[PDB]
């Protein structure tokens, strides 16, 4: 984990992300550099792949 | 301590009167202030918040002396101090001030 960092939305540079809670209880992820909202994650159905190493073992 | 910004909306400075064992003039009051304030800033604090008439403001640095734990049945021989570092301020007000506030008394 230490070998990687999160890219800025607009800046496209390594930065930090902080959580903020709204009045309504809505959680928003905001970047440091640009101060912009982070995009949503990719669906697990798209990232699901078969593990052939396990099958070989 | 934290530096004072240009526009101060929620000041945290705490002002108090200090009872000194020395003699003070009629038109002179002794206060205890932080160690990070200026003459001008002190003046303005009193001028705007309290709205008191001010002529002159003097400042001094107060540092507690060293002490050693030697007394008692089980001394530690360790060093320490009593109190804290502060700014002894002296304000020359227009009006007179009673001595029973600024000066100490003991029978």
């Amino acid at each position: 984990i230490t070998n990687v960092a999160l890219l800025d939305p607009v800046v496209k540079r390594p930065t930090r992300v902080k959580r903020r809670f709204m009045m309504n209880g809505e959680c928003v992820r905001i970047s440091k550099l640009s101060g912009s909202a982070m995009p949503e994650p990719v669906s697990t159905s798209a990232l699901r792949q078969p593990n052939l190493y396990q099958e070989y073992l | 301590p934290p530096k004072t910004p240009r526009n101060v909306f929620f000041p945290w400075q705490v002002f108090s009167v200090h009872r000194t064992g020395a003699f003070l003039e009629r038109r002179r009051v002794a206060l205890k202030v932080p160690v990070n304030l200026t003459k001008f800033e002190i003046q303005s604090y009193l001028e705007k918040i309290y709205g008191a008439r001010v002529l002159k403001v003097s400042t001094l640095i107060v540092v507690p002396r060293r002490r050693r734990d030697i007394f008692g049945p089980r001394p530690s021989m360790r060093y320490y101090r009593v109190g804290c570092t502060f700014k002894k301020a002296i304000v020359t007000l227009e009006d007179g001030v009673p001595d029973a506030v600024k000066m100490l008394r003991s029978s």
Binding site: - | R6, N7, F40, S44
Partner: protein
């Protein structure tokens, strides 16, 4: 008694103030009584007629002894049905309520009156047995404001506005100086 380690805490208690219990062991073995005080923190109970050593002086010139504190594991719950000691089992109903069940008889042991239980002012964990005279005061028989006390009518007043706030805040920030001129 003294404070116990947190790992020793009992989440669910089987004994309540005013409950009838019998001491299982000790100096005062084979003596019954009524619960008067329970300590969750210390894991201890108070029972009348048990450990009465302290003495106090009264204005009438007499003396009275107050019972002490004993471990909660040194007492047992008595079954009114059989009038004999028995272990208790806690059972949770569908409705979400917790009940006490006897092991010998198997009967349901109802809880004591809840109105006769008094809690501490600083610590709710410590319960006490309410007295008849104390309860009568609240049944039939029933702090001035200082100079620096906001009125109850003024304190409650509502003045908050979303639109106003948003309008004002923007302006506040927008209209900000950088240098002092009015000072001298």
């Amino acid at each position: 008694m003294k404070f116990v380690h947190p790992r020793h805490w009992i989440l669910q208690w089987k004994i309540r103030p005013g409950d009838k219990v019998v001491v299982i062991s000790g100096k005062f073995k084979t003596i019954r009584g009524t619960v008067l005080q329970i300590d969750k923190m210390r894991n201890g109970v108070s029972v009348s007629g048990v450990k009465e050593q302290k003495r106090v002086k009264q204005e009438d010139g007499s003396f009275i002894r107050i019972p002490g504190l004993i471990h909660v594991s040194n007492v047992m719950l008595i079954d009114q049905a059989i009038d004999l000691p028995t272990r208790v089992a806690l059972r949770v109903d569908d409705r979400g309520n917790v009940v006490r069940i006897s092991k010998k008889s198997g009967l349901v042991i109802p809880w004591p009156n809840g109105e006769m239980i008094k809690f501490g002012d600083n610590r709710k964990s410590r319960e006490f047995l309410k007295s008849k005279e104390e309860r009568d005061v609240e049944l039939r028989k029933e702090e001035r404001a200082g100079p620096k006390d906001t009125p109850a009518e003024v304190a409650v007043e509502r003045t908050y506005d979303y639109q106003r706030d948003v309008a004002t805040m923007q302006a506040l920030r927008q209209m900000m100086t950088k240098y002092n001129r009015d000072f001298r």
